[PDB]
Structures are given as C-alpha cells and as structure tokens.
A paper describes a structure:
The ABC transporter McjD exports the antibacterial peptide MccJ25 in Escherichia coli. Four genes are required for the biosynthesis and export of MccJ25 (Duquesne et al, 2007b): mcjA encodes the linear precursor of MccJ25; mcjB and mcjC encode enzymes involved in the post‐translational modification of McjA to the lasso structure; and mcjD encodes an ABC exporter that is required for both MccJ25 secretion and self‐immunity of the producing strain towards MccJ25 (Choudhury et al, 2014). We have previously functionally characterized and determined the high‐resolution structure of McjD from Escherichia coli (Choudhury et al, 2014). Its core architecture is composed of a dimeric transmembrane domain (TMD) of 12 transmembrane (TM) helices, which forms the translocation pathway across the membrane bilayer and contains the ligand binding site, and a dimeric nucleotide binding domain (NBD) where ATP binds and is hydrolysed. In this study, we have determined its structure in a novel conformation, apo inward‐occluded and a new nucleotide‐bound state, high‐energy outward‐occluded intermediate state, with a defined ligand binding cavity.
In order to gain a detailed understanding of the conformations that McjD adopts during the transport cycle, we have determined its structure in the presence of the transition state analogue ADP‐VO4 (mimic of ATP hydrolysis) and in the absence of nucleotides, that is in the apo form, at 3.4 Å and 4.7 Å resolution, respectively. Clear electron density was observed for ADP‐VO4 and Mg2+. The presence of vanadate was verified by collecting the data close to the vanadium K‐edge, 2.26 Å wavelength and calculating anomalous difference electron density maps. At both NBDs, two strong electron density peaks of 14 and 20 sigma, respectively, confirmed the presence of two VO4 groups. McjD‐ADP‐VO4 is almost identical to the McjD‐AMPPNP, as the two structures can be superimposed with a root‐mean‐square deviation (rmsd) of 0.7 Å over 560 Cα atoms. In contrast to the MsbA‐ADP‐VO4 structure that adopts an outward‐open conformation as a result of domain intertwining (Ward et al, 2007), the McjD‐ADP‐VO4 structure is outward‐occluded without domain intertwining. We call it here high‐energy intermediate outward‐occluded. The TMD dimer interface in McjD‐ADP‐VO4 is formed between TM2 and TM5/TM6 from one subunit with the equivalent TMs from the opposite subunit similar to the McjD‐AMPPNP structure. In the presence of ADP‐VO4, the NBDs are dimerized with the P‐loop and ABC signature motifs involved in the binding of the nucleotide. The McjD‐ADP‐VO4 structure represents the transition state of a water molecule making a nucleophilic attack on the γ‐phosphate of ATP.
Numbering used by the authors:
A (entry chain B): 4 to 579
B (entry chain A): 9 to 579
The structure:
C-alpha cells in the first residue's frame, strides 16, 4: 500500500515537461536495447561470410553488414548522450516542485515535531530524499525495459540456433543472479538506511556546533567540540564500511559466478569449434553475447539494489514528515469578534510524561482588561500562554473563547484572534520590510513605516531606519532590545482580540518599555492583554494579577491586595 | 589545492589512490592490444585456417577475452577502491572544516548560517571526489590508449586514418579548453545560488514558529520559490552550454571518424585495404570513444571542480592580517581594566562607540546602563575580544588587549552573553564546555549555585538531553545553564550582559550573591535596565549614543541625571 503512494508522490513532482522528459528517457533506453540486441548477429553474419571463403563473398554485403554494426554502435552511444541530457533536464525540472513541497509540508507540521530536529538535519534530509528520487527515476526509466529486451532476445536467438548448453547456462545465470541478489538486497538497504541516518546525526551535530560557535570559542572548548564531531564521523565511517564490505562481497561473488558460468559457455564453444561441431560464426556470436550481456546484468543488479534501497530510505523520510494525525473538528468560516473573553477550565498539561507542568489551571479573563501573570522560572507561564496560542493540543481540561472551544477553532482563525509575543525573538535573515510583512502581507510602505514609530524603531543612533536594512542570521545585526522592537512592530500590523506579551519587553529601557506598552493599549483599546513579567511596575498597571507556582495558580486579585498576602509577590516587593 | 587534497589522505588513503591510478593505467595498456587481436582474427578468417591456424584463432579469441575480462575486473576494482578512498578522506576533511570554523573571527562567522556552512562542506566534499577521480582515472589511461592508437595506426602506414585520428584529438582538446572556463564560471555561479537557497531554507525552518503564527505561508513560500527559480535559471544556463559542447563534440566525431570509416570502406572495395585492416580501423574508432570521453571529462571536470573548490578555500582561510602579540597568562588572581578613548564602528557607515574613557578595578562591582542601542553589549564584546578593529586602547594590568592571546583573554574574562547558547547535548556536555576536566561532583556542586539542582520537585540529572536551542527548558533555566558555566571557570573579570533578565528577583539576587561569594576578587561589570543590580554596584556608568554621559554611585545619579531619576521613580 505504501509502495503505490511512493511512486504516486514521485509522479506528482513531474509537470507536463517532466512527464515527457521521463517518457523520452524510457523510450530512447528501450529503442537502443532493441537495436544493440541485433548487433551480435551482424557480427556472426560478418564472421561466417569471411570464414570458409578465400576472399569469395559479396564485398557489398560485408560493407552493408559493417555499416549496420556501426549504426548499432552509433545509435546506442547517441542514446546514452541523449538519455543523460534528458536526465539532467528532468532533475532540474523535478527539483523546484520537490523543495517547495518540503517547505509547505514543514509549515503544516506541529511545533512539537518541528522542535525535534535542527536546520542542519532538515536541510540534509531534503538532500537525501532528492537524491533518492533521482536514483528511483533513473532505475525505472533505464533498467526495467532495456535489460529485459536485451535478455529476452539473447535467450530467444541462442535458443533459435538450437544451442541448448549456451542458452541454458545463460538462463541459469540470470536465474541464480536474480535469486542470490534479491536474497541479499534488503540486507544492503537496511545497512545503507542506518548509515544515511547516522549521516543526518552528523550534519545535525555540525550545524549545532556552528550555531553555538561563539560559546565554544569563548570557553576555549575546541577539544570538547572537535571530539564529539570526530566521534560522530567515526560512527559514520563504521556504518559506511559495513555497507562497503557487503557491497564488495556481493560484487566479488557476482563476478566469480559470471566467470564460472560464462567461462564454461566460452570453453564449450571453443571445443565445439575445434571439433567442427560449432561454426566460427556461431562461436563469435556466443562470445559476442557473453560480452554484450554484462551491461543488462549490471542494470538488473543495480535495479534490484537501488530500487529497494532508495525505496527504504525514501519511505523513512515520508514517515517522519507526513505522520499528519491532526484533523481537529474545526468550525468552517467562523469569524471572530472585536471583544473576546477567555475561560480556562481545569487545564492540565505535560510536555513529555514523568512530569506535569500545569496542575489544574482554572482562570477567567475579559475584553479590554490587562492581566499580569507571574511566578518562579519553571512554574509554566510560557507553557500556559503557548497552549492558549495553540502550540500544543494534547491538554486535559477545556479552553473557551466566548463559548467557542479552542479545539473547534482553526489554527488560522486562532492566530488571527490571538497574537503571542514570544519570550525569544524570531527575526528572519532578510530586509526589515520582510520581517514586518510576516505580520501582514498586503501592508503598504506607509502602514509599515507608521508601525516603526509605534515600536520606536523609526530612528536608530540619530539616523532614520530604512525598510531595506539587511538583517543578519538571528538578527544579531541589531541590539537585544531592537530585536524585541521588530517583534513588537509586527503586533501593530496584526488585528487581534487577545494580546500576550511573554517577557517580550525585558531587553528594553524604562522609557521605551512604557511608551510601547502605552501605544499597545491606545492602538488596541478592546484587546484582552496577558502580561508575563517578574517586575512590579508591569504587575502594578494590570487590572488583576495571577501568581503561578509549580503548575497551579496560587494567588489572584489586585497587586496591592497581594504584595503582603502572597509569598512570591512579597519576595519581589523586597525593593527597599 | 592538490596539496590540500593530498594532506586529507593517510597511509591507507595514499595506497587506495595509487592502486586506483595503477589499475586504471594497467587496464588501458591491456585493452590497447585488443584491435590488433581482432585484425589477426579477421586475417585468419580470410587466410591460413589450417589445424594450427584454427588453434591460433582460439588462442587469439582467448587473448581478446582476457583483455575484456581484465578491463572489466579493473572497472569493478577501481569503484571498490574509490568508495574506500571516499570513506577514508571524508572524516579528515570534515574535522579540518570544524577546526577551521573555530579559528575564524566572530564577525566572519556571523556572515552566514548553519544551512550555508553545512551545504558548503557538501559542495567541497563532492568537488574533492570529482578531482580525486579525474586524476586517478582520466590522466594516464586515455593518454596510453590515445598514444598506442596513433603509434599502431602509424605503424601500418595508414596516414589518412592516423592523420584524421590525431586531427580529432587536436581539434577536441583545443575546442573544449576554449569553453572549459566559460562552463566553470556558469557552474560556480549556480553552486553559489544553491548555497543561497539552502541558507534561505535553514533560515525559514529555524523561524518556522514565527511564520506559522503569523499565517505567513504565502510570504515564506514565495521567497523560497523565488530562490528556487534563481537556482533553476542558473542551472539551465549551464545545462545548455554543457548540452551544446556535447552535441558539437558528437557531430565532430561523426564527421571526422565517419570519413575514416568511409575511406577504409572504399579501400576495401578497391582492394587497396585488407579486411583485416578495415576491422582493426573500425575496432580503433569504437575503442577511442571512452578515452575521448575521459579527456572530455578531465578537461571540463578538473577545471570546474578546481574553480568551486578555490572559492571554498578563499572564504574559509583568508586571514592576511594577524597581530604577532603572544604575551602569555596576561593576568593572575586580581585584575583592573583601563579603557582609553575607545571608538568603534561595525560597518564604518555609523559610529557605535564615540570616545569611551573608563577605569575599573579588582573586587569592585560596576553597573552599565543606557537606552537600547547605546552600545553596552558592543563595549563589553570589545572588552571580551569579539572585535579588534577599534580606535583607542584597552589595558589589563599594563598589557594591551591587542597583545593578549584570545585563549588567555577568555581565561581572564568570562562574558555572560545577552542571548543564551545551549548545545544540543547532555546538561553535562553544556557545562563541560566551561571546563573539560570537571569531575561529576564539581559539575553537580555548580548546579546548586546556579539554582538548577532541582526542577519541578525532581533532582536534575546531568544526562538531561537538551533539544535544539535548549527549548527543552524555560527562558530562566536557559540563563541558569550559562550561569552554572561561570562557576566551573576561574576569571578575574566577570561580565553579566542582561544575563539574569529571565530570572525572578529571588533567584537573580540568590545567584548574584553566590557569584560575589565564590569570586570575591573578581571585577564585575553588570549590564541591566533593572535597579536591583544598579543599587548594589560600587559605581554606575550611563551610556548614551556611544558616549559615557554619567558616573558615580546610583543614589548620587538619581538626583543629578534625569534618566537615573526617572528609572528609580518606577517604585
Ligand atoms: N553585529 C552587528 N553588526 C552591525 N550593527 C550592529 C551589530 N550589533 C549591534 N549593532 C548596532 O550597534 C548598536 C549598538 O549595539 P548594542 O551593544 O547591541 O546595543 P545596546 O546598547 O542595546 O546593547 C545597535 O543599536 C545596532 O544598531
Ligand atoms: N518545550 C518544552 N519541552 C519540554 N519541557 C519544557 C518545554 N518548555 C518548558 N519545559 C519545562 O516546563 C517547565 C516550565 O516551562 P516554561 O513555561 O518554559 O516556564 P516558565 O515558568 O519560566 O514560563 C520547566 O520546568 C521546563 O523543563
Ligand atoms: O523561564 V521564565 O520565568 O518565562 O523566564
Ligand atoms: O540590546 V541592550 O538589551 O543590552 O539595551
Ligand atoms: Mg516562560
Ligand atoms: Mg546590549
């Protein structure tokens, strides 16, 4: 069942030009194997015409025979060049469609599954899959019809000349070969998959070390860094050497079998020629078939290996990327209001197992009101707002948005209703314009520049900020606070009912922090605001404060009514 | 270039490479006898065919079979040795890259992402492979087969055949070398666009959550689709030139070798040329395709894999400037810092530090504050030796920073960065980054001082696996990993750049207390917008638009300076 889905996926990557290039590749490979299967007869016909005549034969017929053999050789080589030209054209063609399908498939994946592996890994995963497709496309377009044609004609013709020992041992070889190899193909595929997986692990570790180079440099940790890569490379080599040995043995054994079987057919026909039983023409024909048969035997060997091993390695890729189990019963086009109230009822959560992060969070929040959420680091403030922001779906309890449950809200609608300002910044390596267009695609040049003022990013170091400012990897082109302001400017282009600020202002100075937080409430008057902070001034300003401790909400109400009652907030309000 | 590829080969690597060259050379000698054996077989068919001439035909047929068998055994043996050599050279190449990346400057490292550096290694691996191959297979072997052909056809005194044969190799080597550079440039430019495309994929995948939550599939997809379109167009441009060269080389071969075939046909029809010679000539025409092809590869492949590999060495080894300083263990126990008229620019277009003049001393805690964009991080980064292109001077007990080895500087100073750098590995590995030789106890002791020995009423294991960017942990728990590192280190200067922002007042004060206790003589610079650290410091420094605008005690500054007055009023 998964075998059919695999080839349908490869077929789908081919547009109209792609389908033609693939069929042209199949046709040309098939046509040339018909033509080249004729050539050992031509050679035999040349041999007899000369043998046993003392220059007494049609010289015009020898020339016609020599020219037909040349046509065979020329057409077969033209076919090889034409196939490889079509092959590269089809690679180029299928490449783009393959790569976008991956990116679009990655976008539709859940946060939990995305977080599992780094960019180094996902980047080399595409690499392996692209190459795997390539191999499969080739093996199908070249090693299916062509070797069958050349092997059928060879047994048919050798059977026709009533040579039973030759056609017998010939058919015996293809039988012993196809059996022996298939009885060792899976064993190679498994050794190859396991190797390619270790290879992903190795690229994963390289990107992990390169992304945190600064840390390893500053701690003078070259030894620790180098050793864990050297270990990964050693796991890679050993996994590769294990494949190499099996591959080398199969090849040696297949070679020795060919030498024993085809060698006998050669000695048999030698003795047949020496005892006048077999003609020289026929001897040359059997000699010519033995030589010609190597390439279709090679193409079969390849197919049996390459098809099974690229199918296995490609199966594994489709698995860890399309395990789509979501299908949450969402309301079709249920547009959300200006004023939305949140209701969290007995919410429970665990990231893995073994540990519960949220005990039984019961909360009730309303439109146009600002709420503060605090507690020690490890309580689960981020976790709670992430669940509200639909990062995670396997939660116990219920979350409502004016009677409508989160479970019945589409991830697109939820993301339009709520805007989460993350603890960590996510700045795209692109223009400032691009980073802000992330919030709203259709935003005009003015709407974007207006938003810079609101985030206090219209002027940097008494100089006007350009929308074409190129932003380096992780936006380290900008200061900690300037990074936070990019993410803040995004909120102003969006139009949400709920606004979550998870320690999203921590890197800003008192002036900026207050001015932006002011502009937020001004621009979004009816917006419900959840604010996560460890600071009294951000807690003071709220309509109500919530204290989270080890998963459970331990205290509620006004900050002033809590700064003496609650153990945590009294600990914060220890500021002289 | 070839010295670099040679260096990647150990003893097993050098053997495998020479075995590959030998076997390729030996088989081309053997297969160059082949058309003469075919001639003798054609001679016998139209000649001697007595009992002895039948036995001579069989011994001849066996020699041709030996040629064909030995040539194929050689092909299989070469590919076995090639893969063995690939495996062999692979590890040595990859570590050289990592070690080369570690020794690069922060400014150059920041220039490209992981997606880019990862696929950069990929391209160079493949470029080495091609070069190793074209050298071990397409140099001696085609020369042997082309020399012997012209020698033998010259010997049978056929001038038109050996003439047009030599003419082809001459026209071929000329025509192709004329277009090789044009192909290499089109290929390099394509491979570079390919890096740009992998760079954009890793950039999008690393910031997927942002694009997902902003429902930005269209903007994200469009950007990649554009990059892929720049990739296809760069690839199609190479494809066409490649396809033209191949079709023109094919048409030239059909015209020149076709003539040699027609000439010898007419020679056979007019009794001028024997059938035995006619076969030997077509047998040489057929045989010559593979050495012509291997020269076609050698000419084109050696040049294009040298161009793209030249680029890779350029961007990963150019460091013409190197200050021959070297004063060793520049400091012991105690340290003082002296910044004199420090000025700095990142891209020279704008000045970040105007003329910072500061003086700091042992055992004293100092606070540095100012608006976001003033340059607090910039200044401490320069103190931490991130950048060396600065005007002015920085001293560390009379010794200038310029004369302090990056190793010694990193042992004297410990910078706790604004952003956290958690390795995807065990907690043990993340802390062993600070001190390799640290014992299980030294590491666990440090976990307590970091307030990380217990998470959610459970004791923290040193074998805790930490996901990509340490997102397996809370913002504050990430900061505590970086803080736990400091307690394994032994510095004279300790910089805390907003390194406790994600921590609550209880832990911030509790850890900051254990820092001062464990490092009593340590000079401490603290960058904070909060006051619970500014009030605690022996002196406060206010940075505004590059220049240090205010100094002294915090209390004496919330009277004098309006910024410090306004900040304290947040009570
Ligand atoms: N690596 C960099 N490349 C270019 N410009 C940078 C870089 N890092 C920071 N900047 C610029 O230098 C200014 C000062 O740097 P920084 O220390 O990060 O500011 P802050 O006072 O917020 O700590 C920033 O406002 C920013 O525009
Ligand atoms: N993505 C995650 N995967 C696994 N564990 C996590 C994740 N995020 C946080 N945790 C765990 O959950 C707890 C609290 O998480 P978090 O919401 O980030 O904390 P905080 O109270 O600082 O907001 C921690 O004890 C931490 O180990
Ligand atoms: O790990 V937290 O308390 O959001 O900073
Ligand atoms: O970018 V700074 O947060 O150190 O103001
Ligand atoms: Mg949090
Ligand atoms: Mg800073």
């Amino acid at each position: 069942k998964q075998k059919n889905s695999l080839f349908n996926y490869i077929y789908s990557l081919m547009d109209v030009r792609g389908k033609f290039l693939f069929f042209s590749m199949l046709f040309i490979t098939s046509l040339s194997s018909i033509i080249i299967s004729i050539s050992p007869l031509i050679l035999a016909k040349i041999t007899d015409l000369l043998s046993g005549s003392l220059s007494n034969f049609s010289y015009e017929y020898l020339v016609l025979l020599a020219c037909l053999y040349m046509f065979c050789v020329i057409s077969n080589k033209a076919s090889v060049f034409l196939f490889m030209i079509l092959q590269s054209s089809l690679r180029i063609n299928m490449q783009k469609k393959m790569s976008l399908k991956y990116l679009r498939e990655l976008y539709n994946e859940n946060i939990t599954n995305l977080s599992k592996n780094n960019a180094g890994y996902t980047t080399q995963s595409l690499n392996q899959a692209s190459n795997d497709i390539y191999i499969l496309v080739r093996n199908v377009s070249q090693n299916i019809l062509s070797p069958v044609i050349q092997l059928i004609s060879t047994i048919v013709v050798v059977l026709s000349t009533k040579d039973w020992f030759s056609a017998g041992v010939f058919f015996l070889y293809i039988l012993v070969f196809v059996i022996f190899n298939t009885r060792l193909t899976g064993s190679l595929a498994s050794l190859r998959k396991h190797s390619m997986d270790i290879t992903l692990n190795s690229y994963s570790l390289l990107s992990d070390t390169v992304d945190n180079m600064i840390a390893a440099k500053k701690n003078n940790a070259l030894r620790l860094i180098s050793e864990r890569y050297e270990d990964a490379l050693t796991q890679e080599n050993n996994a590769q050497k294990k494949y190499w040995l099996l591959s080398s043995k199969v090849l040696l054994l297949n070679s020795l079998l060919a030498v024993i079987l085809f060698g006998s057919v050669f000695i048999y026909n030698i003795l047949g020629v020496l005892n006048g039983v077999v003609s020289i023409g026929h001897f040359i024909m059997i000699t010519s078939y033995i030589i010609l048969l190597s390439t279709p035997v090679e193409n079969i060997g390849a197919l049996l290996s390459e098809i099974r091993q690229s199918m296995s390695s490609l199966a594994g890729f489709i698995q860890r990327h399309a395990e789509n189990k979501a299908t949450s019963p969402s309301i079709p086009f249920l547009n959300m209001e200006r004023k939305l109230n949140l209701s969290i009822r007995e919410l429970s959560f665990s990231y893995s197992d073994d540990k519960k992060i949220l005990n039984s969070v019961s909360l009730d929040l309303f439109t146009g009101k600002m709420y503060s959420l605090t507690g020690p680091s490890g309580s689960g403030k981020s976790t709670l707002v992430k669940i509200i922001s639909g990062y995670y779906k396997n939660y116990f309890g219920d979350i409502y948005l004016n009677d409508i449950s989160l479970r019945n809200i589409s991830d697109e609608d939820l993301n339009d209703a709520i805007y989460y300002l993350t603890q960590d910044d996510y700045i795209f390596m692109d223009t400032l314009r691009f980073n802000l267009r992330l919030a709203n695609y259709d935003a005009s040049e003015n709407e974007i520049f207006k938003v810079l003022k609101l985030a206090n990013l219209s002027v940097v170091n008494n100089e006007p900020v350009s929308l074409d400012t190129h932003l380096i990897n992780r936006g380290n082109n900008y200061s900690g606070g300037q990074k936070q302001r990019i993410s803040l400017a995004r909120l102003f282009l969006r139009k949400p009912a709920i606004i979550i600020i998870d320690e999203a202002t921590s890197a800003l100075d008192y002036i900026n922090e207050s001015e932006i937080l002011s502009s937020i409430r001004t621009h979004f008057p009816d917006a419900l605001i959840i604010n996560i902070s460890h600071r009294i001034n951000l807690l003071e300003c709220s309509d109500c404060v919530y204290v989270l401790n080890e998963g459970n909400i331990v205290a509620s109400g006004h900050f002033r009514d809590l700064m003496v009652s609650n153990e945590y907030i009294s600990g914060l309000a220890s500021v002289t």
